[PDB]
Design a binder for these strands. Structure first.
Ligand code: NA
Ligand code: NA
Ligand code: NA
Length: 326
DNA sequence: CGGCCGTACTG
DNA sequence: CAGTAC
DNA sequence: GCCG
């Protein structure tokens, strides 16, 4: 399916380098180019052809042809020797490019250096100790078990609750880097107060081991980001997200948390070109603005009972989860 | 050239 | 607010 | 990085 593998592998290396260095826009640009290459119907055979692909410009075309005709990309030999370390540091949940840069300027070079000498935020300390477990993508089965665990715990409070694992799991991938469980209820009200009760229950059985983000001093359209671990010998710690939402937002939440991230932003961009706005909450008319183009409030929500409804209103052919990698 | 999805917590 | 993440 |  990817006729340009020999090419996308090389471009991915540069993209990642720019990314870990904080050059976010340059990296986003590469991503869209790389994605466009992956979906191209055949191997790219010329500069002109490459440039013709939406998402690929002169700069990228030039590199593509260089790889195509020589089998290599010289720019790769000129990547700063600091990239591997910056990557290692930003692999720690809670630590981004700014923190990786700080640690590198202070002279740190290994996870051991970070452990013994770096100032760590509460979230980062958790990210560090579970570094390896978090970098390992778990097999689909485990994801299923984690999702079932959350479902049973929630349904024990209200059998009507609907629980759905999204992210890569819903996109049908064989391995998952995390598990995101979306919860709601058909009656449009019984989702209230589930968060608190659900968390304490999961903590009761030792399933939840660490909390990264969880504002339990607020009961509104919530989110929990933490660490879970299935009972039983040898089980690793895994990243678990729990989002509880009202029934009216279910479709957009399902669409957003299923992803991918590239797909979400592409859809949102597309929504704006049609005078609309897409968020994990809803599909609305264009947001309201002030004299100087400043946003002074939300647009009007357009009811979307199902994901199909979002595509319909955007004038786009429906896409199944497995087809949303970008 | 300037904009690049829209939004949720931490400290 | 600046950073990080979904 | 790309695009308009
Ligand atoms: Na192009
Ligand atoms: Na990180
Ligand atoms: Na909605």
């Amino acid at each position: 399916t990817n006729h340009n593998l020999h090419i996308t592998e090389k471009l991915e290396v540069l993209a990642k380098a720019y990314s870990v260095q904080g050059d976010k826009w340059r990296a986003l640009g590469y991503a869209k180019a790389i994605n466009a290459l992956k979906s191209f119907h055949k191997p790219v055979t010329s500069y002109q052809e490459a440039c013709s692909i939406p998402g690929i410009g002169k700069r990228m075309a030039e590199k593509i042809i260089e790889i195509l005709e020589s089998g290599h990309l010289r720019k790769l030999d000129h990547i700063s020797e600091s990239v591997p370390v910056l990557e290692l540091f930003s692999n720690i949940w809670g630590a981004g490019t700014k923190t990786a840069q700080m640690w590198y300027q202070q002279g740190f070079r290994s996870l051991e250096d970070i452990r013994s000498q770096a100032s760590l935020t509460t979230q980062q300390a958790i990210g560090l100790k579970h570094y390896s477990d978090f970098l390992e993508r778990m097999p689909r089965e485990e994801a299923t078990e984690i999702e079932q665990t959350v479902q049973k715990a929630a349904q024990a409070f209200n059998s009507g609750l609907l629980c759905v694992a999204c992210g890569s799991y819903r996109r049908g991938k064989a391995t998952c880097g995390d598990v995101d469980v979306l919860i709601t209820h058909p009656d449009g009200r019984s989702h209230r107060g589930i968060f608190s009760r659900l968390l304490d229950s999961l903590r009761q059985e030792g399933f939840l081991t660490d909390d990264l983000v969880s504002q339990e001093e607020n009961g509104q359209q919530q989110k929990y980001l933490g660490v879970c671990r299935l009972p039983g010998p040898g089980r690793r710690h895994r990243r678990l997200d729990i989002i509880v939402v009202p029934y009216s937002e279910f479709a957009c939440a399902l669409l957003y948390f299923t992803g991918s991230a590239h797909f979400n932003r592409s859809m949102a961009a597309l929504a704006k070109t049609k005078g609309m706005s897409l968020s994990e909450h809803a599909l609305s008319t264009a947001v309201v603005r002030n004299t100087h183009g400043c946003k002074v409030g939300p647009g009007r929500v357009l009811p979307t009972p199902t994901e199909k409804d979002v595509f319909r209103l955007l004038g786009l052919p429906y896409r199944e989860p497995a087809e949303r990698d970008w």
